[PDB]
Amino acid sequence: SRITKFFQEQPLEGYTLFSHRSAPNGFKVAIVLSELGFHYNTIFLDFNLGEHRAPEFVSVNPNARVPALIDHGMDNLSIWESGAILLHLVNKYYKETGNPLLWSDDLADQSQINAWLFFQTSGHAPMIGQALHFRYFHSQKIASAVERYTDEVRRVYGVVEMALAERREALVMEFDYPVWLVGDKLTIADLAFVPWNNVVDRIGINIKIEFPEVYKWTKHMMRRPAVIKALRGE
Amino acid sequence: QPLEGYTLFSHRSAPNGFKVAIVLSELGFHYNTIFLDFNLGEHRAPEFVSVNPNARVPALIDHGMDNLSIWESGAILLHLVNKYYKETGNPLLWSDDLADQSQINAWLFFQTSGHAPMIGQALHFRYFHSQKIASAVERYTDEVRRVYGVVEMALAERREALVMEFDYPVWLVGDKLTIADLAFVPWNNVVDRIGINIKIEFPEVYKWTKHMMRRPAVIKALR
Ligand SMILES: CCCCCCSC[C@H](NC(=O)CC[C@H]([NH3+])C(=O)O)C(=O)NCC(=O)O
Ligand SMILES: N[C@@H](CCC(=O)N[C@@H](CS)C(=O)NCC(=O)O)C(=O)O
């Protein structure tokens, strides 16, 4: 059944990405796969058709959510949770080339990158998701719930904004030059937010004017080829 | 600030904080805990924000590494196991196998982003929101139960494989206790606050938690 069929005709090389057209978390992985130069195909599951129920899938991700990545080169190794997939990809790239692209070979920087990465996947993403749920998909309207989560999303961007502003000032103590969260270079730490930054408007957040720094940062990332490519569907 | 050891910034009721205490004492690392009084706003003090930009606990200062600061319980555990392993050559609560590390990371991210937050939201609507709203409560309590189902199904599959090769301890990854299992511990003990009876609703999870709650380092940390 499309899914069962795929699992009977998998490739020996590359990666297969399970995602959704409205899954920022899914595009997050596509972005990273793109940036790292990994060849992949994407399967956009249809939950309404019950594809996530497909036992073959629940084997790839016991959670039955997207994204999930099968690393075909490593004996169809399976990885679920966008953050685990991210750490796996950069680790693999670094060990195959000696170049920590979007990562770092130094433990200290890695822990900072992980700090941000966990913060985005467990503090930014979930809060944005709850704001969308109550403002649009809940069985009834609860304004206090929508405000709670909407405020937290703002609070979180406050944190990022402040970190980007400081990284900026430091460079001044040597105006539109790219500034980043860790090691003054682009990392998965930065990339992990791009996808979500593009949907926060839907809960009333206007990055352009609410968070000057965040805006310039998300704009620098959004102009990246790999980022536009991934976002288009390549 | 010491030149050796670790300073753990937590809060007496933060399960994420004890998650760090547990891993820390389990790996034999020496540490002192600094319980923040959120009433005074010590988590928002500029002194503490320089450590955790998010202004929340847990936060950890690694004195041996020039007072390197780590925030986010997930990032902290990865740092501690990576550090313990680079020092001893023994992947305690971790793994030398990359495929297993990815799996350990999977569960870890799942717990920190799909378990702890949901449990936290159930608590909020059942006890702290400006108004009682059943649907909001049911939403998160159901999701917390859906998650325990995932864990349950995995421990059951793990026990099945064991039996081939019985209250023997089974684990999420590599048939050895890892930070993936310990991550759920602190929270496992509080789901009773939202109506989930682990013993009854999730048998395997129950045994799995007994084993962790019984461990020495765990007890020492849970104080
Ligand atoms: C921006 C839109 C609103 C929020 C949706 C988030 S993307 C799709 C969602 N996936 C996730 O939430 C993944 C979370 C997981 N913690 C990860 O980081 O991989 C899913 O599969 N769906 C859950 C389900 O179908 O039950
Ligand atoms: N870094 C942790 C954060 C855990 C967390 O949010 N802990 C709560 C304690 S229950 C906290 O700091 N609360 C302070 C507040 O809400 O102001 C994680 O996301 O894994």
Side-chain angles (χ1 to χ4, degrees), chain A residues 1-174 176-234, chain B:
Chain A
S1 68
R2 172 185 161 70
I3 305 309
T4 314
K5 190 174 193 302
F6 167 79
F7 276 89
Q8 298 301 58
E9 293 156 347
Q10 288 177 290
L12 274 0
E13 310 287 352
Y15 308 74
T16 290
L17 201 215
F18 289 95
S19 189
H20 190 100
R21 312 167 183 299
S22 303
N25 276 143
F27 286 80
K28 193 174 77 170
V29 184
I31 291 169
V32 180
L33 267 314
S34 295
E35 288 294 357
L36 293 184
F38 283 144
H39 311 298
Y40 70 99
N41 299 301
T42 300
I43 288 178
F44 298 90
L45 293 179
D46 183 300
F47 295 70
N48 266 61
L49 281 38
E51 299 198 304
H52 52 128
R53 289 187 261 275
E56 300 89 343
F57 181 63
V58 72
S59 300
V60 170
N61 178 17
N63 200 202
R65 271 43 179 167
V66 294
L69 182 90
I70 298 170
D71 180 327
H72 300 307
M74 291 194 76
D75 301 329
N76 287 343
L77 180 53
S78 181
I79 305 96
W80 41 296
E81 282 295 316
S82 69
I85 296 177
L86 291 212
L87 292 179
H88 179 256
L89 289 171
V90 303
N91 246 288
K92 193 175 182 178
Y93 187 87
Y94 170 54
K95 272 169 177 51
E96 245 151 46
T97 72
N99 178 198
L101 221 215
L102 301 171
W103 191 213
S104 165
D105 51 341
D106 174 49
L107 169 61
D109 278 355
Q110 298 187 191
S111 57
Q112 297 306 293
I113 293 168
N114 293 162
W116 283 107
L117 175 51
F118 269 99
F119 173 55
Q120 190 290 132
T121 67
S122 84
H124 178 238
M127 296 313 234
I128 298 178
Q130 301 306 156
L132 288 173
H133 174 71
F134 285 101
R135 178 174 185 183
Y136 301 115
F137 315 99
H138 203 226
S139 45
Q140 58 175 167
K141 176 181 175 174
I142 307 178
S144 52
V146 175
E147 178 157 15
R148 163 194 178 64
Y149 297 123
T150 298
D151 283 340
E152 184 67 4
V153 174
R154 283 202 164 81
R155 218 272 306 168
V156 176
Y157 274 102
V159 180
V160 184
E161 182 62 34
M162 184 177 72
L164 295 168
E166 299 180 10
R167 309 295 184 279
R168 166 134 283 146
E169 178 205 309
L171 252 49
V172 177
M173 179 184 82
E174 59 220 358
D176 306 6
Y177 210 71
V179 77
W180 312 100
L181 302 171
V182 186
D184 293 66
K185 54 176 286 191
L186 179 67
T187 68
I188 43 178
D190 309 291
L191 295 179
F193 294 83
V194 201
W196 295 90
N197 292 165
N198 295 160
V199 313
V200 286
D201 49 70
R202 300 171 199 180
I203 53 174
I205 299 180
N206 184 174
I207 295 180
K208 170 75 177 180
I209 53 179
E210 289 190 54
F211 306 96
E213 278 307 299
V214 170
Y215 182 71
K216 301 151 72 177
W217 170 67
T218 201
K219 231 301 86 62
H220 279 298
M221 284 186 296
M222 282 190 287
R223 275 190 280 78
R224 271 181 156 279
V227 178
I228 290 168
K229 164 190 177 299
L231 281 43
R232 280 187 98 306
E234 305 175 7
Chain B
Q1 309 181 187
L3 213 187
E4 153 262 36
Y6 308 79
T7 297
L8 174 275
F9 290 90
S10 185
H11 175 308
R12 306 179 189 299
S13 70
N16 310 76
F18 289 103
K19 187 172 65 178
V20 179
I22 291 173
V23 172
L24 233 26
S25 52
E26 194 78 42
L27 302 176
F29 282 146
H30 290 306
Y31 67 87
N32 275 291
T33 310
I34 295 183
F35 289 105
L36 296 185
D37 192 357
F38 293 68
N39 273 177
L40 311 193
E42 294 180 350
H43 53 294
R44 283 169 290 176
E47 282 74 54
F48 182 68
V49 170
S50 53
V51 164
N52 188 342
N54 197 205
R56 308 228 173 299
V57 301
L60 184 81
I61 301 295
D62 188 334
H63 304 305
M65 278 169 75
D66 294 0
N67 295 312
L68 166 73
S69 199
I70 306 79
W71 48 290
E72 283 295 326
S73 65
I76 296 177
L77 301 204
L78 285 176
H79 182 275
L80 293 176
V81 294
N82 268 90
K83 187 176 189 172
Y84 184 90
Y85 177 54
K86 180 177 181 181
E87 291 186 354
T88 61
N90 172 51
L92 244 200
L93 304 185
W94 187 218
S95 176
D96 54 346
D97 177 54
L98 199 66
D100 280 357
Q101 285 179 178
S102 66
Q103 296 301 141
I104 285 162
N105 286 168
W107 291 101
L108 183 59
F109 267 95
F110 178 51
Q111 196 291 131
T112 61
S113 79
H115 182 250
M118 304 291 85
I119 287 172
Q121 307 318 109
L123 278 170
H124 179 72
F125 286 93
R126 170 162 178 173
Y127 304 111
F128 314 78
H129 206 214
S130 64
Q131 62 183 65
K132 299 177 64 182
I133 318 177
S135 65
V137 163
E138 181 178 358
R139 166 185 174 66
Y140 298 103
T141 63
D142 282 319
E143 186 61 6
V144 166
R145 271 185 253 243
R146 190 191 68 72
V147 173
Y148 274 107
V150 177
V151 177
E152 181 67 23
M153 185 65 262
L155 293 175
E157 255 156 40
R158 233 104 312 175
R159 170 147 287 145
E160 147 206 292
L162 176 65
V163 166
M164 294 191 271
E165 186 177 304
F166 293 10
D167 59 299
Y168 214 69
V170 281
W171 308 102
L172 292 175
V173 186
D175 319 274
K176 66 169 291 180
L177 173 75
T178 62
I179 48 176
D181 304 286
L182 295 170
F184 296 79
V185 184
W187 298 91
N188 277 173
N189 308 326
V190 306
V191 293
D192 59 353
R193 279 261 285 166
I194 53 179
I196 296 165
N197 181 179
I198 291 170
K199 184 177 195 172
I200 288 178
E201 304 181 60
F202 314 97
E204 289 290 316
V205 171
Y206 184 60
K207 283 175 286 184
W208 172 70
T209 328
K210 245 173 185 290
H211 276 296
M212 293 191 283
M213 294 185 293
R214 267 183 176 55
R215 312 176 63 78
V218 187
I219 301 164
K220 190 71 196 69
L222 283 42
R223 296 186 180 300

